[PDB]
Each structure stands twice: as C-alpha cells, then as structure tokens.
C-alpha cells in the first residue's frame, strides 16, 4: 500500500483546523511536536522502536486514535466508574511526593 | 468538597492494575508522564489551545473527574478533543503536509529557524 494522491496545502489548512490546538510544528504544546513525526518511533511504543508513524499508521491513528491505541498496545484507559476505586487511587497518588515516607523510598530506589 | 476516606494500599493495587502499564512513578520513561508528584501539579493539557496562564491543577476533584472519563474531562476543560477524522482524503492531505515537516524538506527547512 502506497499513500494515495493528496494536497499538502489542504493538509496544512486541515492541520491548522484540527491539530494545531494541541500540537506544535517546531523542532510548549500539550501533545508532542509533530515536526519530523513521519517514520518517527511512536511514544506509545513505551506503553506495556515498536510502532513507526508511517503512512498506514498515521492514517489509522487519525481515523480512530483510541481504537488504534487499543489495537497496537492491547489495552487503553477509558475511565474508572467506581468512585471508591478512584478515591483510593488518589489516596495512593498523594503519597507519591518528596515529603511522604513512601515517596521518599521511591526517590531512594530510583536514585540508586 | 473533601476527599472521602480511602485506602492507599488498595490504591497502589489499583494503580498497578490500571495505570502502571502507561505511567511510571519515578521522579522526573513510560508512554504517559510520570505520576510521581502529580498531586496539585499543573496539568499538561493546560498548554492546550495556547497572556500567561496558571493552568489546570490536578487536585482531588480534578483527578477523580479525569479518572472517571478522561476524554470528557478534556472536552470540558479544553473545550475540544480529538476523537478522529472520518474523511479519508482529509487524513491523506494531513499526511502529505506532515511529510514536509523534516530537516531535509524545503518547507521543513524554512520552518527550521533558530
Ligand atoms: C488535543 C486537543 C489534541 C488534538 C486536537 C490532537 N491531538 Fe494528537 N495528541 C495529543 C496528545 C496529548 C498526545 C500525546 C499522548 C498520546 O496520545 O500520544 C497526542 C499524540 C499524537 C501523536 C503521537 C506522536 C508520537 O510521537 O507518538 C500523533 C502522531 C498525533 N497526536 C497526531 C495528531 C493529528 C494528526 C491531529 C489532528 C488531525 C491531532 N493529533 C489532534 C492531543 C491532541
Ligand atoms: C495507556 C494505556 C494509559 C493508561 C492505562 C493510563 N494512562 Fe494516564 N495518560 C496516558 C498518556 C499517554 C497521557 C499523556 C497524554 C494525555 O492524554 O494527557 C496520560 C495522562 C495522564 C495524566 C495527566 C498528567 C499531567 O497532566 O501531568 C494523569 C493525571 C493520568 N494520565 C493519570 C492516569 C491514571 C490515574 C490512570 C489509571 C487509573 C491512567 N492514567 C491510566 C496514558 C495512559
């Protein structure tokens, strides 16, 4: 499969419209810069040089990002309904700080 | 609103089950950002739709809401979210545009400026 014919001017305009809001194009934004993203190793490769942002992968991601993530990583986070579970997770996250004994031990581990 | 009573041990268990796959807990790599010291941190999506702005804080209520429905949280606080682009030709044109964002492409060469 090769990339079908297209219009890079329409492409730049569609990028302004649909992607610029969260993506820079400089070598500051919420999402990663999309400069030199073509054939670049995708960040979701770290989830658990995997996935390359080639033509097919760019077309599939843009069609349905959540489905793409689920299909290539195997899982995805769509939310936790149980309020108590989220409360417990927040209780855990509050200890992940430099002034809590648990977070102190974390700094110990990842610093050695 | 006050954070209701909770269990930090069950919290660690649930974190392992549901968040560790994409999130590290190291001081600062994983796909997502490290969640160490995320409490009261300025959320990354504060940079969305970038006159200085303090941004969104990951406090109790916001963490709970986001964990409930992340994409709904994003839509509510940013105003927009990316759920996909159905039209195939728009995607092909975007790919054509992105292929020019390199250090060796003319347009990419011009954009590269420091
Ligand atoms: C915010 C409202 C966004 C909009 C609009 C678009 N994207 Fe995005 N994208 C966003 C974030 C926060 C992230 C990082 C987290 C993640 O899910 O990966 C991304 C990621 C990408 C990537 C991956 C880059 C990598 O190095 O792996 C790509 C290729 C990408 N986004 C492209 C893209 C396009 C083409 C968009 C419009 C058509 C678009 N994004 C919109 C947040 C947001
Ligand atoms: C991948 C499959 C993920 C899983 C499972 C979970 N998260 Fe996530 N999260 C992921 C990415 C790629 C990103 C960055 C892009 C984005 O959409 O923001 C995030 C972001 C967060 C954040 C925001 C961090 C910040 O703004 O500094 C938080 C607070 C967060 N994630 C928490 C979180 C929790 C509590 C999860 C399980 C209960 C969880 N994430 C799962 C990818 C993935």
TrEMBL record, chain B:
The keyword Metal-binding applies. Heme c binds at residues 19, 22-23, 31, 41, 44, 58, 82. It is found in: Mitochondrion intermembrane space. GO terms for biological process: mitochondrial electron transport, cytochrome c to oxygen; mitochondrial electron transport, ubiquinol to cytochrome c. GO terms for cellular component: mitochondrial intermembrane space. Residues 6-102 form the Cytochrome c domain. Keywords: Electron transport, Heme, Iron, Metal-binding, Transport. Coiled coil: none annotated. It comes from the Eukaryota. The keyword NAD does not apply. One of its GO terms (molecular function) is electron transfer activity. Belongs to the cytochrome c family. This is Cytochrome c, putative. It comes from Plasmodium falciparum (isolate 3D7). The chain holds residues 20 to 148 of 159 of the full protein.
């Amino acid at each position: 499969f090769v990339l079908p014919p297209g219009d890079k001017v329409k492409g730049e305009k569609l990028f302004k419209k649909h992607c610029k809001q969260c993506h820079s194009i400089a070598p500051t934004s919420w999402g990663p810069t999309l400069f030199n993203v073509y054939n670049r190793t995708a960040g979701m490769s770290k989830g658990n040089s995997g996935i390359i942002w080639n033509d097919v992968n760019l077309l599939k991601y843009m069609k349905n990002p959540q489905q793409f993530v689920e299909s290539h990583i195997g899982m995805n986070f769509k939310g936790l309904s149980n309020l108590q579970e989220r409360v417990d997770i927040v209780h855990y996250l509050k200890t992940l700080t430099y002034d809590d004994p648990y977070g102190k031990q974390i700094v110990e581990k990842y610093t050695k």
